[PDB]
């Protein structure tokens, strides 16, 4: 469902949402989440601090 926080104003679906990943291939109503990185271990704002002092 649309339990999550919604940033647009009136364009909300107000209807059946779903995640379209594994319910089927290509069938369910669309609301797909996109990760930055599939498995997250360390943020790369730390690696950019890691080399920039050495640099």
């Amino acid at each position: 469902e649309d339990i999550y926080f919604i940033v647009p104003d009136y364009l909300i679906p107000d209807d059946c949402l779903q995640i379209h990943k594994l319910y089927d291939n290509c069938m369910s109503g669309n609301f797909v989440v996109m990760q930055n990185k599939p498995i997250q271990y360390n943020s790369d704002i730390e690696i950019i601090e890691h080399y920039t002092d050495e640099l």
Binding site: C16, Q18, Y23, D24, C26, M27, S28, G29
Partner: peptide
Amino acid sequence: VVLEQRIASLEQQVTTFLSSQMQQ
């Protein structure tokens, strides 16, 4: 062809509403 897609969309709509009140 077009129906094949809408028929697929409505079956998922039935399935994701049946599970909201299912015994499953």
